[PDB]
Amino acid sequence: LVHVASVEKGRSYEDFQKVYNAIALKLREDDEYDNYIGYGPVLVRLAWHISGTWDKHDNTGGSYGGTYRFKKEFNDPSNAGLQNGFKFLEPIHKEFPWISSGDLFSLGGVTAVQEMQGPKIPWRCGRVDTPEDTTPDNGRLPDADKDAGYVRTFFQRLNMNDREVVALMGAHALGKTHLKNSGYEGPWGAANNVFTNEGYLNLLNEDWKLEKNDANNEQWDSKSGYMMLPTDYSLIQDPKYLSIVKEYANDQDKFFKDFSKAFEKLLENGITFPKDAPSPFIFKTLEEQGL
Numbered sequence: 001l002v003h004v005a006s007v008e009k010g011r012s013y014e015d016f017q018k019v020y021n022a023i024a025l026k027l028r029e030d031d032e033y034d035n036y037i038g039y040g041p042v043l044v045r046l047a048w049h050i051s052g053t054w055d056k057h058d059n060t061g062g063s064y065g066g067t068y069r070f071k072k073e074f075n076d077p078s079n080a081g082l083q084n085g086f087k088f089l090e091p092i093h094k095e096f097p098w099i100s101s102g103d104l105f106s107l108g109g110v111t112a113v114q115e116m117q118g119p120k121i122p123w124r125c126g127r128v129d130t131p132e133d134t135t136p137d138n139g140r141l142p143d144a145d146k147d148a149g150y151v152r153t154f155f156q157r158l159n160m161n162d163r164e165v166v167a168l169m170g171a172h173a174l175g176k177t178h179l180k181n182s183g184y185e186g187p188w189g190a191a192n193n194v195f196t197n198e199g200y201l202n203l204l205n206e207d208w209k210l211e212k213n214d215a216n217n218e219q220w221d222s223k224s225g226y227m228m229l230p231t232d233y234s235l236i237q238d239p240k241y242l243s244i245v246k247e248y249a250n251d252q253d254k255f256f257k258d259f260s261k262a263f264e265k266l267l268e269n270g271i272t273f274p275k276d277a278p279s280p281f282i283f284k285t286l287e288e289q290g291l
């Protein structure tokens, strides 16, 4: 199964920076969603869930096909709540009818990290929409109630190594869990929408408590109002994982650099780039543009 990238006809950098600025400008404007967290965290959850379906053995799933627009995937129980991000992006796709589904779902993910002041993420255009029968079956996304052995094995399928998995997981400092979407709840009072290494610091300095929630599921709670999933608490339980968590809690610049490489690797898995293709784009933020 080969997926070759194909630039939207005649488009260059300047065109994608317009679509970036439209997403960013709506991110600033619709600031009230989810008790003033805004849409940034669910847009990077969407980019991760449309790519997280990839399988390195047969090259099915991944961000290239834009198959999330189809009922089977949009109704995946693992994607409960992400309809909110899709409806956010929908006026923007109407405005730029020429961008493919895959490129828009992954650019929303890039834009959200940079506008929430995380690292720059190089991005590459060219995903092509594919037919409804290429929609991957439900069940390729991870369970939250598990341990380090499960996370390590799950991520081998996206061939992510330990250091890439621990950097990727730092995004769980953003947003919150919602009992009606996943059966987990919290953080309580002040959820975060700035991108920082704070999750690693909290994991190592909070006093955590294994409690059971209103959906009868167990999670780790802290006196301060912070929570963690079983799969998140895994990172201090495993010796290889814990030594990388200590590395990032003590160096926010090495964390930003390593996240940017693993997040771009995640959005690009499964795609073949022709050697005459444009170099990756680095988009300016509204703040660097004075907008």
Ligand code: HEM
Binding pocket: 041, 042, 044, 045, 048, 080, 081, 142, 143, 144, 145, 151, 168, 169, 171, 172, 174, 175, 176, 177, 178, 179, 181, 182, 183, 184, 229, 231, 263
């Ligand atoms: C073992 C891996 C993972 C599991 C089990 C998992 C699971 C979850 C769960 C249960 C939620 C709450 C959903 C809800 O109730 O609304 C959540 C949210 C979120 N996750 Fe993950 N996740 C995983 C990996 C990742 C990765 C690798 C990223 C990003 C690169 C990520 C980013 C996010 C973000 C930003 C949210 C917040 C959504 C919001 O505020 O609405 N997750 N995660």
Ligand SMILES: Cc1[nH+]ccn1C
Binding pocket: 172, 173, 174, 175, 176, 177, 186, 187, 227, 228, 229, 232
């Ligand atoms: C701690 C956490 N896990 C998933 C989301 N969040 C905020």
